Ligand binder design. Sequence first.
Ligand SMILES: [Cl-]
Length: 308
Amino acid sequence: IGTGFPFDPHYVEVLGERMHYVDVGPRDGTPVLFLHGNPTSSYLWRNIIPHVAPSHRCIAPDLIGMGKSDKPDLDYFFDDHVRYLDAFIEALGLEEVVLVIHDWGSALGFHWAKRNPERVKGIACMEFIRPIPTWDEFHHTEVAEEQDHAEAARETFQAFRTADVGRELIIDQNAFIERVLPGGVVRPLTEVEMDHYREPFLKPVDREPLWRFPNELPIAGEPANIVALVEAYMNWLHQSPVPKLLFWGTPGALIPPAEAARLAESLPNCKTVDIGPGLHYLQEDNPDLIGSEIARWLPALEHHHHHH
Ligand SMILES: [Cl-]
């Protein structure tokens, strides 16, 4: 699996700050917008984009306070991210797009789509965020062998959301980067890959977005604004005719194989793709199948639409 990041560095001004993004692919192509989550960057998509770029424009921003984007004095709430990515999209003059999304990138992407449904020609998603009404639903599974792992996951994120303790882990010990990220890849990440992921967060104080994110997860009614927002987009998604492509792995994390199977029915016009062994950061386990299946699925999205 490729460890390099060979893309031209692009930057654009957004709400006064700079945001870094990948922009490859023919300039005249329907754009495909790749949205990473916690605690990743555009690096997450490095081995997926080359499958899509021969035919389409590939745009992959680093969220504010992450990757090579600027680091304003914010608390990095989800709404902060909403503001910057909304302005990013308009700053590139994008009209209609295809979304490719993960984790908090999926919350952002789905929220954007629901508010801008006529501008989304398709959604490729994987290990995405859903309402979590109870902790038992978090990493829920009915596969006996996976139960111990699932309860460990609960404990982990309960701690992240525990006052002072959470900050200790994520801010002082860099747990999201040194433990959660490699912990959510089946194959071993290399030093080179880890170093790419560590680069934006060498200073602990810069780790704030990595702590706020788990504290923004819509679990057991809190935080209420996010619970509402996530319920809204999921209702939207369940009712939308927009073409969907869903990647999943075994045993998965947020999305277990059994639910992936259900989403194949509960989500209209949904093709599913088993990437084989996977945990949360599926992109690092089978980037080639994710990029090739996205590429195979993009042409038909032009149907019923036109550029002229
Ligand atoms: Cl998180």
